[PDB]
Amino acid sequence: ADTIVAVELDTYPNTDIGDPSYPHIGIDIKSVRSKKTAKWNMQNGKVGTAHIIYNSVDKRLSAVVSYPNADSATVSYDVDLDNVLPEWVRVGLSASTGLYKETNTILSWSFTSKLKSNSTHETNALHFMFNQFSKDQKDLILQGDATTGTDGNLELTRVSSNGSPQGSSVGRALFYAPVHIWESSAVVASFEATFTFLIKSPDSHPADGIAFFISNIDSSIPSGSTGRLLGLFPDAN
Amino acid sequence: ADTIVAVELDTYPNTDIGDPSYPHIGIDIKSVRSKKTAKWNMQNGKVGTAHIIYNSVDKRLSAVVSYPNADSATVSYDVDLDNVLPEWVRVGLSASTGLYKETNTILSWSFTSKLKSNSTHETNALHFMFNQFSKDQKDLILQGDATTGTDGNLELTRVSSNGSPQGSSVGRALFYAPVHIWESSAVVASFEATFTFLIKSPDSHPADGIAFFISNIDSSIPSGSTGRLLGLFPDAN
Amino acid sequence: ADTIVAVELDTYPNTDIGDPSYPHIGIDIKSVRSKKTAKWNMQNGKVGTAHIIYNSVDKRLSAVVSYPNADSATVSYDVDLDNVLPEWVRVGLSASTGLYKETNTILSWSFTSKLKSNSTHETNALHFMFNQFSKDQKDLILQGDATTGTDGNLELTRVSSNGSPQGSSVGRALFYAPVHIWESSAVVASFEATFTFLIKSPDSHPADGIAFFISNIDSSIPSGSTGRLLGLFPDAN
Amino acid sequence: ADTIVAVELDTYPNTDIGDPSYPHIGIDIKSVRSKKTAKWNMQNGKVGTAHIIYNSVDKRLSAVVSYPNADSATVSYDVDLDNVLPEWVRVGLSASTGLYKETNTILSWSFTSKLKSNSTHETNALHFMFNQFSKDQKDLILQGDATTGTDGNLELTRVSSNGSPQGSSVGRALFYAPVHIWESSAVVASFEATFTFLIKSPDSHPADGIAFFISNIDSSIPSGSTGRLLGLFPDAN
Numbered sequence A, B, C, D: 001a002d003t004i005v006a007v008e009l010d011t012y013p014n015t016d017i018g019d020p021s022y023p024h025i026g027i028d029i030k031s032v033r034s035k036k037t038a039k040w041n042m043q044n045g046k047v048g049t050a051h052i053i054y055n056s057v058d059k060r061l062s063a064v065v066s067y068p069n070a071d072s073a074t075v076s077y078d079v080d081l082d083n084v085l086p087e088w089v090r091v092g093l094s095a096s097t098g099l100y101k102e103t104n105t106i107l108s109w110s111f112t113s114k115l116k117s118n119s120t121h122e123t124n125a126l127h128f129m130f131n132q133f134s135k136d137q138k139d140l141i142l143q144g145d146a147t148t149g150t151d152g153n154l155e156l157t158r159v160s161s162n163g164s165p166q167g168s169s170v171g172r173a174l175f176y177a178p179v180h181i182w183e184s185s186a187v188v189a190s191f192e193a194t195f196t197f198l199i200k201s202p203d204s205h206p207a208d209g210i211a212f213f214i215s216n217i218d219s220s221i222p223s224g225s226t227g228r229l230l231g232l233f234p235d236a237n
């Protein structure tokens, strides 16, 4: 069914479905078993920042994750997205919790997409930046347990009144408008996404993670995609 | 029904419904009878550029229209858009033809909207830029006779195969995503729109015009809004 | 000598040279006696944000100052900067202390200037954004006691090792490159500046203030411009 | 002496100093003998567009050159610019002519540089865009025969009154302000440059080319750097 390209921030090592033995960042092309991963020194309760970049000349999806005053983790992968995704896609954020849990809070998110033609001075661009989410965010499609407005934040997975994270939860937020990633006469196509997140868990082994994904425009949360499946895939194939 | 704020480029003087005796630019707040107009020295077959700006501190909607190597026309109006439009709106371009006609071709369109909070470093922004339209532009809602892709342009009103403009036509194009123009804690809100257009008519008295508008998100072309009513209003009140 | 246009954040009421009886924001055109002022509820030790905007269609310099969780102060003034400043200018930040004092710390500064011609698709733009200053900031001209790099901040006026503010100090920081604010064929010219500042004083009556200014490119700190003269004017005329 | 990183658009094949047997695009790291080249189907008298991108995560300098309605040429090279250039550099355009010649006209140039820290929300950015050059362009350092203002264009090498290109000419234009390309705590550093050029020659074998370069901030045209040496290197080593 859905086509998914995601950058995952996987907090719980399910070494049974391929995770390394630690929290890691990975690049997933159509499967939960990452094509590439990097060790991520995850910090409970600290605000992190994820940066994701790509361009159709280099055909390399790269991601960098950092915490203030910390060394950063980075992961890269050669892949031609023209061969994996449709011409028009929707971009979004997803997260889940399972028997273990954590809060998956998004404090900001910006995205920029550009298509430059061979025509003199011809660039098509899309840019959005959210530094504050409101209770009725009409430019986002919220799926699952995702909600906006709490503390002006985006809560991807369920959190009780006190802000405690609930288990077995899954939620996604997609930017309302379709994004154009390929064009017949495009000489260069590129995108970059940035998001700041706060993962906090009362547990020692928090789970599952957060992912930035790009999918077919009509993507929806697959059945049984809670836990280790990050609200993105239907199975662990 | 609909709430409309538009900047019109009115090519045909219907002095019976308030137009001056010449082609003019005007600012319309909920009625086709402009609150303010400026004389516009319209050029048949030349590519023009319209710039529209506004900010919630000054509460002034201003518009500038120019042609290369020509003096420019400008029109301004004090108005607090918080008191006229809803919190969430859709922005778009509209055009019409009646017994007289012309081509209403859009070659490019960019829009930028920003909401800056009192929170340190908190700006929400939306920006889009089209320098090339494709036949299946999924981020635009096309209404009426508007079509995209011809010569990579946006044709707001009907044009025969040879590119001749048809009479009694009306079409609009709206950016797919809702735009947020007011926010509770916003200290400054602003927007700016730019579009380049080509108005060409085989006639001496071309009609009717083109307008940049902002409306409720569910706006649709009112009945009998061809001609002088610019695809925007239902009557000449 | 110098030509100065400044937006002042005046913390000390010198009602003898025209200040109101309280901390205020004012717009200064070539004299320290503001053309217009607004009451500013200044907060000791809180991080504030100043936004300044202008455009050559409206010919209105407006400024908004806010603190998180606070109502904001705003001040506006009709003025055609084409008639006051040269074609090429330098933009900067200035501050001073006198018998009373305070720290004048700048945590971030961004500026955007645009000149749009009547030529199709012809915009000249300059944009800079500093969210971190380094000890050897080669794109800034530092005058007086201004220094960079401390805590990655810009310190406009002298501060002892413990960060205590010194009296009788004056410093300015100017962006290295000249900025083009008018152009023969320009149909619209605009600029916007944003800066976040931290004013902290161990005193009850802190003094003097901070100002965003625009001046001739060879501007330098006038003699005896400490205190109430904000490092900008030579006298209180 | 100078440190040079350049993207060359080499119109004349000096196969004696390493050029392929045709017009090509190449990436030069400290020597005129390109580390990498691509065949470039050069078009006399047509307006081309060069796009150059780089980011410190991928450590790949890539360049794309196109003409309207033409297939584009692209060239890439893995190189860590932190190991080749200083922390602070100046960016510019250079060109030359020798016994053979051509006009080296620049119609537009934009550059964007960003440094993103590990600090939450901390980006330093520089952006400039010239779509029109004026006779007294105070934000550019012009060296050699480069001049501005003709037809609102930048003429890198000498052209007689009729616009005929002169031989043995060399000129460069550098953006006035120093650009910061590395920073201690930077997690990601990137830049992108775009320029449109018009190479026209009354000859069958036009020479020599144009190059986008990055150098030490005090770079100046080396002695005898006309012709094949592109105003960038002192010798063909």
Ligand SMILES: [Mn+2]
Residues within 6 Å of the ligand: A010, A011, A012, A013, A014, A019, A208, A228
């Ligand atoms: Mn896992």
Ligand SMILES: [Mn+2]
Residues within 6 Å of the ligand: A008, A010, A018, A019, A020, A024, A026, A032, A034
């Ligand atoms: Mn994993």
Ligand SMILES: [Mn+2]
Residues within 6 Å of the ligand: B010, B011, B012, B013, B014, B019, B208, B228
């Ligand atoms: Mn009319």
Ligand SMILES: [Mn+2]
Residues within 6 Å of the ligand: B008, B010, B018, B019, B020, B024, B026, B032, B034
């Ligand atoms: Mn009218």
Ligand SMILES: [Mn+2]
Residues within 6 Å of the ligand: C010, C011, C012, C013, C014, C019, C208, C228
């Ligand atoms: Mn004072």
Ligand SMILES: [Mn+2]
Residues within 6 Å of the ligand: C008, C010, C018, C019, C020, C024, C026, C032, C034
């Ligand atoms: Mn004052």
Ligand SMILES: [Mn+2]
Residues within 6 Å of the ligand: D010, D011, D012, D013, D014, D019, D208, D228
């Ligand atoms: Mn050569």
Ligand SMILES: [Mn+2]
Residues within 6 Å of the ligand: D008, D010, D018, D019, D020, D024, D026, D032, D034
């Ligand atoms: Mn070569």
